[PDB]
């Protein structure tokens, strides 16, 4: 067993430690070759055929790079090759939990199928990671290369999903994989506080590569000039002051990707259509899991053996099906091929109001059809004619939450409107399955009255 | 009306409504599910791209070239109708590709049905006809100024070549356009000098997705391209100062062939996928016209069934529980675990000899029949061998190259079996009179 070299269009030659290779060459990891990074965006952006597998490789590579650079610059931090391998594995496996079409699956489908359950792709990543280890004898390999499986598995899972929870006192280091003097390690793969992690670096670069958008962030420069420094008796990753411009570009790039691609109107309508087909197919598709037990699309998340076989393939399985009981679902997918899509009715925001929770998504269409427009309208619409799409931008923490250092005093952190505009953390769009112009006028009337009733933003276009 | 597409390599791409209506069909959308490089993706994580985007690019480039020629040289009499027909031909040139692209017509069908002559170009013509007739395109073509009778034939001739050659009759064989428009047949698929918009797009795109340097600039070609007479025939000619660009292109191609298309592990994996397909052929069902069920290897006889034959077959086998599919499944599972066929050696045919597809299936048997020379402890059957045949393909105004390579891999992995396989391979090369292998 020796290292391997993979040639990647974003990162060039990426070296893989044999333990990482052993983890990658499993059904549980190879599964990610069959889940598109951007879900339905590929039906708007023909270049966006990339899957979660290559992005995961990139994230592992970048995690290794950043942590090694910090160790080389600062021996005093006592970063060991064991720590590097654990951070690399966490970067590799952070997206194991994604379902078909990525953010579509846990963002919208599962809430609509089982409003009662609380599912995230991060929980799924933890579950798939455990399953991959116990299905492939990874623990002896980990030991072979100096890892301590109990502690280090806990550390990886903590990087992926976060602390054990049970806040309780909260004045105390909540993690168990590593102690406080290695806190900065938890800031590499997934950093919620300020929004700078190697995961975002890779998918910013990769999505820009595949979409045709320019990426002005130089992650390599940032890695070169990153260090560890002291803030409030804690240790954090900080950037050289001279890097401010780089960060500006990063944030702007983020904004562009969100505005032009991630919340593209037609792409999200198509995500909605695919989810509708999945909902109308859920009762009739079986996925065989542990013990030959059958599962549905919406319940495969409860058995990782079944989840392992749940990918974008399900789309085609519905499209190619001959079962009469699936015809409904099939038809919707066929409308996608013929480009007979749901009609965009409008957009609104819950500005100043409580935001819409996942557990309530299913109730929204009914609400819309229950609005009473103050005109005859001579055309009545039902709940199933409406789609309500809730688009959440998940980060209010600009550059301000970043720590900087001077080349004069590297160990200590330092104490404009040109920064990117705010994110509008929740958008609510409505589409109509009926396409005749009378039905669309009626649907718009219903939508405007519904926004009035909910005290949401008055829709534009009027 | 006029849609715009935002391609990663061509930027913004405006599309005529007729082209959009051709694209928005199951028969064309199918290409979203066929990977451009087949199994190369299992070696290059960036090579996730499919034939659909490539086809869009080829149509766009064909339009660009024809229109650029038309703006210049008005004496050629290029109508918008000609531009639209060329764009459609470029758009539809790859409709006939099967699962994993060149793996299908290049290896799988020859092994499965050694007696049929199948190519993805003739499949493209069949699928184009099926698309036209299943979605009422002819009235739309008329609506935009086309003559379906002449122009459908024109498109099919652009894709597959002359419909003729039943007898000698050596003269102008095209029926879709007169000889004075002959140059239009050189745009989408050029058989003479290997210069066409299809190659431009897929060189650029494969470079973009593989991480390989693209040294040439097709825009310079289009801007400095003209039509001129060469030996009493109209042809696409280039301003002389463009030679430096031309060479660059041929370097890129060369690199793309050596680094990616002929990658040893990628070709081994193509072979493994084909072996799985063979062991699933008796059992996989693909519903076709009238509800008749087809196999993978016979789905090419019904375009309705072929419309539903894509890379998904792979996963259909991987996810199956039918015990009859177990063997196929296991091969795919080995791919996931990276327990691959072992590489035994490489050789070349001598002189102009070219092994033909109809004989591919005979090659392993031959290898297992060679008498090694000394003796052997382990004996290997024909099923233990894979013989992989790899092929590679005067412009008017530097590396290995070998018309055919034959590589042998072994399925048994132990050292003893691999030594035996090497002995078989070297003897077989001696018996066919092929070049003695390496080492
Ligand atoms: N066409 C296409 N575009 C593609 C493709 N790959 C990427 N693109 C890029 C370029 C496009 O400009 C962009 C956005 O898509 P769009 O189709 O132009 O629609 C935009 C408006 C919202 N869409 C609908 O509501 C709609 C649209 C069209 C028809 C119908 C309809 C018609 C009859 C009955 C019914 Br019932 C529904 C509804 O995506 C592709 O393969 N095909
Ligand atoms: N691993 C991986 N690499 C990947 C991946 N995506 C791209 N790559 C790039 C990086 C790699 O350097 C390059 C080439 O692939 P390789 O896996 O390194 O194998 C090279 C020789 C193949 N030939 C064999 O026969 C072989 C090889 C190894 C083991 C066995 C074997 C072992 C036990 C029993 C049996 Br029975 C067979 C056989 O592909 C990926 O997902 N995974
Ligand atoms: Fe990620
Ligand atoms: Fe092509």
From Swiss-Prot, chain A:
Annotated residues for binding of dATP 2: 7, 44, 221, 240, 242, 246, 264-265, 407
Biological processes per GO annotation: dATP catabolic process; defense response to virus; deoxyribonucleotide catabolic process; dGTP catabolic process; DNA damage response; DNA strand resection involved in replication fork processing; double-strand break repair via homologous recombination; immune response
EC number: 3.1.5.-
Effect annotated for changing residue 178 to H: In AGS5; loss of oligomerization; decreased ability to restrict LINE-1 retrotransposon activity
Consequence of substituting residue 209 to A: Abolished ability to restrict infection by viruses
Impact upon substituting residue 199 to A: Loss of function in defense response to virus. Loss of dNTPase activity. Does not affect oligomerization
Annotated phenotype, changing residue 252 to K: Impairs homotetramerization and nearly abolishes dNTPase activity
UniProt-reported outcome of changing residue 336 to T: In AGS5; loss of function in defense response to virus; decreased oligomerization; does not affect localization to nucleus; novel localization to the cytoplasm
Active site (record annotation): 121
Activity: how regulated: Allosterically activated and regulated via the combined actions of GTP and dNTPs (dATP, dGTP, dTTP and dCTP): Allosteric site 1 binds GTP, while allosteric site 2 binds dNTP. Allosteric activation promotes the formation of highly active homotetramers.
Residues annotated for dGTP 2 binding in this entry: 7, 44, 221, 240, 242, 246, 264-265, 407
Necessary cofactors: Mn(2+)
Disease entry from the Swiss-Prot or TrEMBL record: Aicardi-Goutieres syndrome 5: A form of Aicardi-Goutieres syndrome, a genetically heterogeneous disease characterized by cerebral atrophy, leukoencephalopathy, intracranial calcifications, chronic cerebrospinal fluid (CSF) lymphocytosis, increased CSF alpha-interferon, and negative serologic investigations for common prenatal infection. Clinical features as thrombocytopenia, hepatosplenomegaly and elevated hepatic transaminases along with intermittent fever may erroneously suggest an infective process. Chilblain lupus 2: A rare cutaneous form of lupus erythematosus. Affected individuals present with painful bluish-red papular or nodular lesions of the skin in acral locations precipitated by cold and wet exposure.
Subunit structure: Homodimer; in absence of GTP and dNTP. Homotetramer; in GTP- and dNTP-bound form. Interacts with MRE11; leading to stimulate the exonuclease activity of MRE11. Interacts with RBBP8/CtIP. Interacts (via its C-terminus) with CD81. (Microbial infection) Interacts with HIV-2 viral protein Vpx; promoting interaction with a E3 ubiquitin-protein ligase complex containing DCAF1, leading to subsequent ubiquitination and degradation of SAMHD1.
Protein name: Deoxynucleoside triphosphate triphosphohydrolase SAMHD1
Organism per entry: Homo sapiens (Human)
Gene designation per UniProt: SAMHD1
Residues of the full protein shown: 113 to 584 of 626
């Amino acid at each position: 067993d020796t290292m391997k070299v993979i040639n990647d269009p974003i990162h060039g030659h990426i070296e893989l430690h044999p333990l990482l290779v052993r983890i990658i060459d499993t059904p549980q990891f190879q599964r990610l070759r069959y889940i598109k990074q951007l879900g339905g965006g590929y039906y708007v952006f023909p270049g966006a055929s990339h899957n979660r597998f290559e992005h995961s490789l990139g994230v592992g590579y970048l995690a290794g790079c950043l942590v090694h650079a910090l160790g080389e610059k600062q021996p005093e931090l006592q970063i060991s090759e064991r720590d590097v391998l654990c951070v690399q594995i966490a970067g590799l496996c952070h997206d194991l939990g994604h379902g078909p079409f990525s953010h579509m699956f846990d963002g919208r489908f599962i809430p609509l199928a089982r409003p009662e359950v609380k599912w995230t792709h991060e929980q799924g990543s933890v579950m798939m990671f455990e399953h991959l280890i116990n299905s492939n004898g990874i623990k002896p390999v980990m030991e072979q290369y100096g890892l301590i499986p109990e502690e280090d598995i806990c550390f990886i899972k903590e990087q992926i999903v976060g602390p054990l929870e049970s806040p309780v006192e909260d004045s105390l280091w909540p993690y168990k994989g590593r102690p406080e003097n290695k806190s900065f390690l938890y800031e590499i793969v997934s950093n919620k506080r300020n929004g700078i992690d190697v995961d975002k670096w890779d998918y910013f670069a990769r999505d820009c590569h595949h979409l045709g958008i320019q990426n002005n962030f130089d992650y390599k420069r940032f890695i070169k000039f990153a260090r560890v420094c002291e803030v409030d008796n804690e240790l954090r990753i900080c950037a050289r002051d001279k890097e401010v411009g780089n960060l500006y570009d990063m944030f702007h790039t983020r904004n562009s990707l969100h505005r032009r691609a991630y919340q593209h109107k037609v792409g999200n309508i198509i995500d909605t259509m695919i989810t509708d087909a999945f909902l109308k197919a859920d009762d009739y598709i079986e996925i065989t899991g542990a013990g030959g037990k059958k599962y549905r699309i919406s319940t495969a998340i409860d058995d990782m053996e079944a989840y392992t076989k749940l990918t974008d393939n399900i789309f085609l399985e519905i499209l190619y099906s001959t079962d009469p009981k699936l015809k409904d679902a099939r038809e919707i997918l066929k409308q996608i091929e013929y480009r007979n899509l749901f009609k965009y009715v409008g957009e609104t925001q819950p500005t100043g109001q409580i935001k819409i929770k996942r557990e309530d998504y299913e109730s929204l269409p009914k609400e819309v059809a229950s609005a009473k427009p103050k005109v005859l309208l001579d055309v009545k619409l039902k709940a199933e004619d409406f789609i309500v799409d809730v688009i959440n931008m998940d980060y209010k923490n600009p550059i301000d939450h970043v720590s900087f250092y001077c080349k004069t005093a590297p160990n200590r952190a330092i104490r404009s409107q040109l920064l990117p505009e705010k994110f509008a953390e929740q958008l609510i769009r409505v589409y109509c399955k009926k396409v005749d112009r009378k039905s669309l006028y009626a649907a718009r009337q219903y939508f405007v009255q519904w926004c009035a009733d909910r005290n949401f933003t008055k829709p534009q276009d009027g």
